Design a binder for this molecule. Structure first.
Ligand SMILES: O=NN(O)c1ccccc1
Ligand SMILES: O=NN(O)c1ccccc1
Ligand SMILES: O=NN(O)c1ccccc1
Ligand SMILES: O=NN(O)c1ccccc1
Ligand SMILES: O=NN(O)c1ccccc1
Ligand SMILES: [Mg+2]
Ligand SMILES: [Mg+2]
Ligand SMILES: [Mg+2]
Ligand SMILES: [Mg+2]
Ligand SMILES: [Mg+2]
Lengths: 357, 357, 357, 357, 357
């Protein structure tokens, strides 16, 4: 039996070429927890967590470190390890930061398991590597920069981009989208993301005007937990409502899809519960007829999407590029999984120093 | 006018006379974060958080300490402060540890506001103080200890006790309930709590047997988030299914009640979102026709129940008694709100020093 | 314990600069009951009731006076006082005139409680004063006067107006709206109100033509109690259906929202049950995802809306201006809560004389 | 042709032989408004309203007196008069005291119309007079008085009685029902009435125990407006749940029956909207398969039941007996409509003088 | 007690100025059963039945004659007489021809009862006579005659007409409607009737094209009993679906409205169960929010509609003009009820001879 022998985490706050502006606030740098999971077979599993705000960063690192003792000497069997953690956090609430930390462990464990068998994760999941179409993910950038980032993305061979909207006025949402559209042409996806900023009637009004414009999908139009409200917005639309980045575990995804919140889903490898939760999520999207994309975590999402029966898009937003070797590449807009064991995440150890919190 | 001028937290791990054994693990000490919210009016708001396990304790403290930057210099206006926190944690997930941190702030802010106005909290909410019936809350204690603790509670004048069940065999659940019944008589409540330990069919089978015995309610028979499963259990019962201690915010309560998960509710003053979330929860319980009890936090729950239109039971489990002056008392099994501004929490400073971690 | 020591009411019939014409009849003057609630702390709570027609005015005053004996010597604890009244009127029917009278007591009691603590009501509710956007509320005025009132409102810095429609012909509804629109421009809200005058098919026909025109919302298209019928109208519309002024208590609001009658709500501080009912109402709108405005009662609604999580608009219709000091002001179209304790309602005692019935 | 030419009201407070005790308060006298509707045909229509408590008595009289201006000089056409009243009270809320006032007018107008045609009311409605089975309606009387009143009713030839329950302990509800049962035998109805006193779970628990005893129905187990709660109670019962005395208009009946609140109905001739509302209620009860009884107003209810397709029981509780000639009689427990034009109400003028307030 | 003393029927087949062409066949003459109901007060009640096809005419007359013995010596109390007939035909099936015959009896009985009290039926129902708007009902007439009948109807002051459609091709439906429209102008109702001729998809296609044209309603688009199918068609339309002429009894109407088959209703005085069934029907349309028109039977429908809370249109199609005195008149397109007792139906006895079958 291969055993887990140790856990080490490191908190960084890493710079973004382009700060992520949203209609509810800006993420100017990336607060990350980098996770190393040591094993008795001598390999080291790697993953990372995104804490969104520096306010949650130290708390997340502390929680993982305190969780070290419950995983050390457990078998490196991510599925059994997830059940053990779901039980240990039964009382406290297996959600939120605690679930995110459990996901970080899970992703490092599956990386480790791929390394034990010297096989890329995608193959360990029983699937073939294949290129996965990717959209370049931008932010609430203003007409000028939004249009430039779009052109550049199109120059690099991306077939779609996402821009984050929710400007003070609807006309401003539309001017950004029209300006991207003039510059990329009609054969190009423009996904838009409201980041939860509208109430249901505002969302219906804005969304029907954006749909007239031709957008590829409308993402998180209202409060993320409000699945009934998403359903109400979706009911007034032909264009699909998109959500899922905020589902904490496949049980949240199940509740949203059960009441018809959306016609597309994009779980987040961390929030959905890592590789173990992702695989469950994929089973749900398939039965519910829901094309499934990724949210962040582009390195592991390239593997995961290749094992996903309704795989739709990979989101390109390179949060961890400063501290992770660029072994994932893009050819003609598609993510290409590297020929490395597990996930293909290699730390740029020389760089992690600049960013330690 | 009145501003928040400081936040101070203290992590303590308090050994309990009677460890809280449950079917899914034992809580042998109470890991609490003690909160002091200093104000420009000079009075200081007090509250505390329960972290369930030491594993989450330092993470939760660190979390609050980092949240201080968001609240210091803000007006002492619990409702506007809560709206601000929901917005600040919009992206990261306003749930779990983060929502619990926010609730501790809220509870200490309302304590401070009651202090500003030199009025007990119940009166600031527009209600009168009045004795609230309380059950003495025990645990997965074995036949012998459970009967003994039940006898003791009956002598103290409690008219109900709660025991935690989910022993390996149904015959054992039933033996504990029988032995308590023989000890306390037919005119006496025996609540039971499975702490999420059964799947739906075992819950239906055990619950129907318990209902033949005569129990007052059946609490969390299955996984706390599985509202549809609770409904399925409730559908096969005359006895009421009880839940809610695990609802993170009133929006989770709204989901559970919308599909008929339970016929009783017991929000946890911390998980529900503090005073602000509790008052919202009570509006919901009133409209859905749900008698609403409390879970832990007996000091603030006595106030809050008095303001609760469908107020049912106060749970008495004295987690903070080692560190808080016993200003809340019990006459004839009823909680008696002390005549003290805000919540009536006064730290036992000499005691706190022994439990700091 | 602060106690209620007396109740005094005065019925007035006060002149309106602009009579309120609706498609179901005209309210040419304001029949009001002015309420003074005396306390043992020496302060006096103030509120008023709107009786709609002089036909109900004396009956409403008489009922309050007869209710004096059941509230005198009760604690000034509006929430406990509301429960006592709900119980005392259990048998007779806690709705209609009786519920309106109970609301009048409630609003005077919360005014009194704010005065006891020398704090504006909004702060007593735990929220911060903030300016609240307001629309100027006009009536079934005819193309000429409708357009003038609109211009004037826009001149005073209002960002929207409401006009009451339901003229004998659809073309007349549209000519009024088009004429307001030409004169205010496209960046301006035009709310329309049918005052219950249409049956469901007529409402669907008229409403779809108004929606083509661009209106901000369509208010009470059909019989107020007919929530199923509202839902049927709402189902055929993208523009939101608005209602709520006629909900007697939050239990009526709950029934309407449960079956999807509307996408916006506007409780009436009096009919919803005063401050106590309003706060419950706000909890419902929030969980149901419903932007919540006020109906009349502009003085107390400015406070209430500042404590309302989905606060949407304040309705400006100054029914009581003749007998109430203008301490509420409007800056750039927003209501500004005055810096006075409780509600900030001060009687113009010199003027009440002219209007006594 | 025939016009209304006057309205006269008289408020009386009539002491009752047996005060109507209920679990939520005692009605020790009957506060009634006696109505005389003078016509151009010279006959005068009679009806009365029950105000429940003296607190509402003067307000209700004043209300009618002010409503006189709307009806005097209108044709005596109860149906068109009702439509006019609904429109006049469109804005103010056509419910509660206002709807009760309107119903008194309606009942006196139909009495007058029967007088114009010199025909008993039942015949004007197109039905034959026929004996209607009646239960003798008692109250929250204690074991001893309840048994005694049950024996008396059985000797008078009643085949059923109703008792009001909701004593502090279930054991007490059950003792009263047992003692009545022993007195009257197994071939005899015992209806029971909780007068809104239980929450849903206590209602389910008490109702299941009562159903083991053998009772004829369970009336208003919970808050009268909580139709969803009644359904939840009914869902756990074989015995039928009975309600309706509190429905204000047939539209409230329609809501309750639409969601399955009850398996029996008992509209109140006043609250339902008089004869006009009652005939609408009977159309609904017939379509929803609901046996329909009456509540109070035995004089007019005998006529109305005879015209009611699913007619069940007449409630006999003689509130107006002190002031109305006993022209309605009881043979073998059946109400016998007197052969008198309209309702057959004749004032006892010498008696009325003693009770005027 | 007034008693029924005899029943006499006469079958006629009467000529139509304009044969009624429908998409499922032609009714070129009117097969009618004329009913005389003799009473012991010396008056004679009159009604008639429409048998649709001569194939059913003798069978209908025979059935009534055979029913004579069960009504002779019964009281003239139409409501009690209807219940007796519902019971007598319990086993055989109280629907179809038997229900139509029972309705014929009912309508003659209410005519008789109006005559006993020397009062027009409308007043006996407690309502005021008022003019009722009427549309002139034409048939599947071809572009040329359809347009002429429209002009003539408009010349006589009708504000709307109905034409029967379902031509072999959609373009033909549209050419007829466009041609009527050019000739009447935009301020004029054009109702269209498919007479059950389309399947659900054809109905959705045709109906959406007619709705583009502006029609007032689309009547019986598919198989009359197929309420689910009507609902499916209605779901794809803004214009209202109309039906009801074929509902046999208010219990059929109740089933159709319960599942949302239509947004307008038009019961047929005969099929709905005569005056007794109509009054029940009106109670349903009111609660369900459904504007209610008549189908045929214009003489009694003028009275009935005046007592109908959601009265919408009277259908003018004078089937019985050849054998009934023209006491009903039309002023400015409205039906005017004549000042005669009961229904105002007087036989042209000199003419009945020409048409006896
Ligand atoms: O789509 N992704 N969203 O919304 C995001 C990503 C990173 C930071 C904030 C929001
Ligand atoms: O009801 N209280 N429960 O379930 C509890 C209490 C303490 C620790 C864990 C669970
Ligand atoms: O929107 N408010 N309505 O409808 C109103 C206000 C005052 C008087 C009458 C109607
Ligand atoms: O059934 N009758 N009830 O409930 C009643 C009667 C009189 C007074 C109050 C309630
Ligand atoms: O609308 N009335 N219809 O459909 C009708 C009337 C008479 C004969 C045939 C059909
Ligand atoms: Mg997003
Ligand atoms: Mg528990
Ligand atoms: Mg309005
Ligand atoms: Mg009752
Ligand atoms: Mg037809």
């Amino acid at each position: 039996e291969v055993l887990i022998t140790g856990l080490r985490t490191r908190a960084v706050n890493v710079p973004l070429a382009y700060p992520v502006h949203t209609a509810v606030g800006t993420v100017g740098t990336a607060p990350l927890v980098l996770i190393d999971l040591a094993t008795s077979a001598g390999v080291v599993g790697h993953s990372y967590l995104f804490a969104y705000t520096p306010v949650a960063l130290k708390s997340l690192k502390q929680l993982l470190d305190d969780m070290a003792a419950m995983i050390v000497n457990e078998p490196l069997a991510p599925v059994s390890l997830e059940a053990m953690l779901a039980k240990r956090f039964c009382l406290a609430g297996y959600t939120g930061l605690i679930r995110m930390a459990a996901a970080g462990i899970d992703m490092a464990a599956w990386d480790a398991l791929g390394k034990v068998h010297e096989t890329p994760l995608v193959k360990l999941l029983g699937a073939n590597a294949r290129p996965v179409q990717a959209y370049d993910s931008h932010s609430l950038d203003g007409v000028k920069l939004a249009t430039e980032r779009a052109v550049t993305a199109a120059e690099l061979g991306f077939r779609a981009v996402k821009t984050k909207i929710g400007y003070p006025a609807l006309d401003q949402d539309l001017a950004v989208v029209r300006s991207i559209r003039q510059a990329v042409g009609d054969d190009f996806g423009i996904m838009v993301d409201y980041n939860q900023s509208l109430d249901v009637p505002a969302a219906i009004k804005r969304s029907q005007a954006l749909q007239q414009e031709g957008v590829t999908w409308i993402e998180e139009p209202t409060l993320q937990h409000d699945y009934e409200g998403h359903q109400r917005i979706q009911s007034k639309l032909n264009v699909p409502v998109q959500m899922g980045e905020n589902w904490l575990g496949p049980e949240e995804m199940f509740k949203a899809l059960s009441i018809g919140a959306c016609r597309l889903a994009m779980p987040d490898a961390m929030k959905i519960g890592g590789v173990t939760g992702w695989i469950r999520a994929s089973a749900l999207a398939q039965q519910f007829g829901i094309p499934m994309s990724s949210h962040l975590f582009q390195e592991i999402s390239a593997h995961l999407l290749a094992a996903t029966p309704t795989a739709h898009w990979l989101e390109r937003l390179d949060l961890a590029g400063s501290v992770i070797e660029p072994t994932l590449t893009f050819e003609g807009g598609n993510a290409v999984i590297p020929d490395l064991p597990g996930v293909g995440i290699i730390w740029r150890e020389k760089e992690i120093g600049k960013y330690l919190v």
